[PDB]
Structures are given as structure tokens and as C-alpha cells.
Design a protein around this ligand. Structure first.
Ligand code: 3QX
Length: 285
């Protein structure tokens, strides 16, 4: 729960989220290379605002206890106060984006639906804690095992106040635009309902086994086209407002495609809840 910095032996970089990376370290207090492997998150950039974002992330993940959410291990203690690190569990399989591509051939529709059902359960639990993820994508999901997935990357996660159902992010966005809901794209309005939009994109990613040629970017870029003096985001928004949607992935079962269409409902209120999606996915298997 408190990891001494001197005992955290650096191995390699796992990911590069902006303002701070995630590294693979071994917790080696005996110094003999026999200790357990862990994932350590730290800020790289500096400008007290990101430090408050990092402390928020820690507090958020610390108060989360689900089989479908990446496990918090503790924090790091060293010759500080620069800069404190978030210690989490390491999932040797890595992100589901890479796993889907490495094992296309062995993952059938029931397995994809099992992952979908699990991501869903984890999203239900995030909603129940008033947490909005803002970064649901296959790249931010980890494989614990052949039949077990977990949600991760809580760097953009915000807690909803008790009086509100949405969060208006002042920023704006620095993630690929193909996962955002139309209301986040136009007014930066994030909520549980915008996480449901993104979930439909995660359903699309799973059922295209994260193939790069029919990926959310690749397919939206082809159906968007090339305008004269209109920015890419505005064109995507014109496309979504017109009711155009990503098209059903090759060999995708009809039921799953209809489910993605529900997740992509134009207005947030018409999008099903994660608790509504849950039994639907279980029924399909
Ligand atoms: C899902 C990510 F956070 C996105 C980029 C780094 C990923 N993090 C990882 C984490 C973690 N606790 O965050 C844990 N295991 N792991 C194996 C490969 C990558 C990651």
C-alpha cells in the first residue's frame, strides 16, 4: 500500500498518456530480481493543475473495488515531494486492442460478448460511483486472462457532483475524436450517457478485432471525405447529426450491430443505461 521508491526497479515503458506515462517496474525490496511486477504511473509534465489531476486519479482508483476495474496497489514513497507515483497491478497480456489482433483466430462471437458483458459490468459500477471515464476505448482495457477483461486509464476520469448528471470540461479534448459522443464534440458535455456512446465504439472495436483498416478512424475518415475549409471535427459532427454511423463490422451478428446503434442514439436520454445493456449482452452470451 506504500512502496519505497528505492525498491521499484524500472524495466520499460508500458504506455504514454499525455502529462504522464505508465512504466513496468518490479517491486524488489530484497533486490534479487524475484519480486512481483507492477504498473507505475507518473506525471512527466509540470504545471500544478495536472498534479491535482494526478491526485484526483489516485483517489478515484483507490475508492474502486471491482473485478472489472484495474487494481490499485498503493502509492510510492521516496526522497520527495517530487512527484509521488501511482502503483497498480500489471496485466502481462496488455491492452485488448493488441490482444484482439494477436488472437483474432481463436476469439469467436461468444468470447467477444463475454468481454462486452464484463466491460459493461465495470461501466455500471463506475456510474454507480458517479465516475465518468471519458476515455473508454479498447486501447484502455486490459486482459487479465483469456476470459477476463478490466477497465483502466483513469487520467481523464471526473467525479459527478451530487446535484449534476453531466460534467462540462473547460479543456477541450486531446484524444482521437472517433470515440467522443456528439455532445462532447460540440459542447464538451461528458456524462454516463457519453460513456455509453463510447461503449458502442468499443463494441465496434471488439467485433472488428481492432483491425487497423476498418478501425473507427479509418472508416470515419473514408465516409467523412475531404471538404475545402471545414475542420475534420466539424465534418464528423455534420456526419453524426445527419444520422450517418459507422457501419456494421464484417460478419458481425445483427443483434450486436442493433445494440451499437442504440449506444449511438442522437440525444443522450435515448441511449440505454449500462445496467440495461448488461442483461442484453448476457442474453446474446
Ligand atoms: C491501459 C493503459 F493505461 C494505457 C497505456 C498503458 C496501459 N497501462 C497498463 C496497466 C495499468 N495499470 O495502467 C497495467 N498493465 N499493463 C500492461 C500493458 C499496459 C498496461
Amino acid at each position: 500500500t506504500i512502496f519505497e521508491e528505492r525498491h521499484l526497479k524500472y524495466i520499460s515503458q508500458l504506455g504514454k498518456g499525455n502529462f504522464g506515462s505508465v512504466e513496468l517496474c518490479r517491486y524488489d525490496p530484497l533486490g534479487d530480481n524475484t519480486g512481483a511486477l507492477v504498473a507505475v504511473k507518473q506525471l512527466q509534465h509540470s504545471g500544478p493543475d495536472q498534479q491535482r489531476d494526478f491526485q484526483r486519479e489516485i483517489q478515484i482508483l483507490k475508492a474502486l473495488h471491482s473485478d472489472f476495474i484495474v487494481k490499485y496497489r498503493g502509492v510510492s514513497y521516496g526522497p520527495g515531494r517530487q512527484s509521488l507515483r501511482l502503483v497498480m497491478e500489471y496485466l502481462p497480456s496488455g491492452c485488448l486492442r493488441d490482444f484482439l489482433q494477436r488472437h483474432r483466430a481463436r476469439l469467436d462471437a461468444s468470447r467477444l460478448l463475454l468481454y462486452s458483458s464484463q466491460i459493461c459490468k465495470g461501466m455500471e459500477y463506475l456510474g454507480s460511483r458517479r465516475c465518468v471515464h471519458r476515455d473508454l476505448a479498447a486501447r484502455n482495457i486490459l486482459v487479465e486472462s483469456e476470459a477476463h477483461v478490466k477497465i483502466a486509464d483513469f487520467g481523464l476520469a471526473k467525479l459527478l457532483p451530487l446535484d449534476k448528471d453531466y460534467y462540462v470540461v473547460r479543456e477541450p479534448g486531446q484524444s482521437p475524436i472517433f470515440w467522443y459522443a456528439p455532445e462532447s464534440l460540440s459542447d464538451n458535455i461528458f456524462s454516463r450517457q457519453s460513456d455509453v456512446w463510447s461503449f458502442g465504439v468499443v463494441l465496434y472495436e471488439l467485433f472488428t478485432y481492432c483491425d487497423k483498416s476498418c478501425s473507427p478512424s479509418a472508416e470515419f475518415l473514408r465516409m467523412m471525405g475531404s471538404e475545402r475549409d471545414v475542420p475534420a471535427l466539424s465534418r464528423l459532427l455534420e456526419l453524426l447529426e445527419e444520422g450517418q454511423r459507422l457501419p456494421a463490422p464484417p460478419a458481425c451478428p445483427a443483434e450486436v450491430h442493433e445494440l451499437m446503434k442504440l449506444c449511438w442514439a442522437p440525444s443522450p436520454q435515448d441511449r440505454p443505461s449500462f445496467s440495461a445493456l448488461g442483461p442484453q449482452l448476457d442474453m446474446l452470451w
